[PDB]
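User: quick one - fold this with KUB bound?
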Amino acid sequence: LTEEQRMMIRELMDAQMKTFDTTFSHFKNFRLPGVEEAAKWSQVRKDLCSLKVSLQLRGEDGSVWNYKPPADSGGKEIFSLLPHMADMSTYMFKGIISFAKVISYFRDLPIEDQISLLKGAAFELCQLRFNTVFNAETGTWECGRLSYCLEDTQLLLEPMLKFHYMLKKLQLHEEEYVLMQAISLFSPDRPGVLQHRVVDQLQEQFAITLKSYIECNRPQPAHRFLFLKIMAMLTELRSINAQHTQRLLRIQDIHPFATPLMQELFGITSLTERHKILHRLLQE
Amino acid sequence: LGVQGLTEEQRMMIRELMDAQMKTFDTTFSHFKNFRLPGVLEEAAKWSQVRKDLCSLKVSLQLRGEDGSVWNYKPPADSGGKEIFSLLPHMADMSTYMFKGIISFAKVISYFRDLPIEDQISLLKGAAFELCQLRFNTVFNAETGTWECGRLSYCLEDGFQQLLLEPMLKFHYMLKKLQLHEEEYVLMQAISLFSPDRPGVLQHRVVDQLQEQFAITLKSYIECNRPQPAHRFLFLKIMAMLTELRSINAQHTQRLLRIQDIHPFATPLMQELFGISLTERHKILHRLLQEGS
Ligand SMILES: C[C@H](Nc1cc(F)c(S(=O)(=O)Nc2cscn2)cc1Cl)c1cc(F)ccc1F
Ligand SMILES: C[C@H](Nc1cc(F)c(S(=O)(=O)Nc2cscn2)cc1Cl)c1cc(F)ccc1F
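Assistant: Sure. Structure tokens for the protein plus KUB:
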């Protein structure tokens, strides 16, 4: 309700509008699939077997291209979709870097802390953004004309998939999603963060603003614990991020797939010296 | 009876055509590659006649990979624009691959090689489409309405009432219901190939003499391997199908020319085979006939 909190929300909403391509209209020129080490490979097959999707592409003319992924025989076939996913990820991360760049509170932080927080949060803000275009009924991320759909076997076992169903079930507003994004972004306990106390205070103010928004703009006591439900989802998302970073690195080690922007974000081969693309993107 | 009921020359004749079929028909489509696909993401009365045929023959396209995956292309509903032409480049590439197989098929048959070069062109110009349709029917699944071309599958769009009107589809459903042997398919290809009354045939009599012996051999073959009353009048049924196919060949050429006129899609070989000295204009055909094997 306070005017600072109103302008705080309006800044994030403005940011989200300027930087989230909801229709995926500008995502193009992306790749598609074609037409001791054993212990690493065993683990990498297990990693990919959880998060399998079919890919649907609706043409401007009314046509539909549908990709169904191969069953694991035990070879490079399991990596089929990695080049496409990397391009989609990279496209999404560029959106998140822009999102952070228009927040005044973020720009005021030293560039090393801006990098550290984006390293920490990029994945989480992608997943939060992907949740807004997720369809729980059909199990499908509707990315404009491009569309990722889960394969059968149940699915709820995989922490990342469980997260998407649970968050979507909360039926959050646009304002609540951007406030989740701000709380994730401004996390004081990410590695390499010098200004711990300032970021912690900013996080608190975003949390209070969300807590106050839910209190004021929703029925009570119906949504009595909704702020805490959101906080549980952020903690659970932070856990998934750690799990994800491990999985990606294991895969990368065997089968190099990551774009240069991803390599920097996940720590693949001074803080500004090691993250030159990210640094360049934050200056421009 | 078995093959003992055929003369030595007839056994030899069938043996040659079958050997030829085996050497020149890639039934799994392993060597068909580097083809176009539909891209990812008073005059007006002509457009009407083009649209009507292309509706009936509309197919979805499936692409299995050795890795295990499937790429599936469902084509667009008629919006009233260029979208109706999206599969033509592909279909033209598949056609050209099939035609190269038919040209190779003709080449290894002795009776064809001994003809003059101009007749070889004239007969292939006359029978290319026919022999392709005969080959396509051998991979046609009637239950699913799908031509199963190994890794490629072309599947008809959604049933039988609308589709059995269209002569080319009706042809495929009818010929499949006869349940022909390989030997009967290759002898149909011979009878179509050796047609004495194609345009530009100089050796009318020698081609006619050859045709008659292939028809005689087919009749004798049927009589030696078809004892049951399920296959009554099978020879005459087959010959009526070849007459029907030649009608569909005329109707097909006239579609192609109408489409090519408004939306150019044909490969240089298709231009030669459909006309878009005899040897000089038919440059690629002449080349392919000289290359042997
Ligand atoms: C919609 C969402 N897409 C998605 C999620 C990612 F984490 C990445 S990544 O961070 O770049 N890592 C990565 C790339 S190839 C293997 N790992 C990229 C994408 Cl496109 C998604 C979520 C899910 F639970 C199951 C399937 C999905 F497609
Ligand atoms: C399987 C077969 N495909 C096929 C048929 C053709 F006639 C030609 S063509 O002769 O080159 N001319 C042509 C090229 S683009 C339109 N016409 C090529 C192909 Cl690949 C088929 C048969 C059918 F009855 C209905 C649909 C079909 F796709």
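One thing worth noting: The radius of gyration of chain A is 19 Å.
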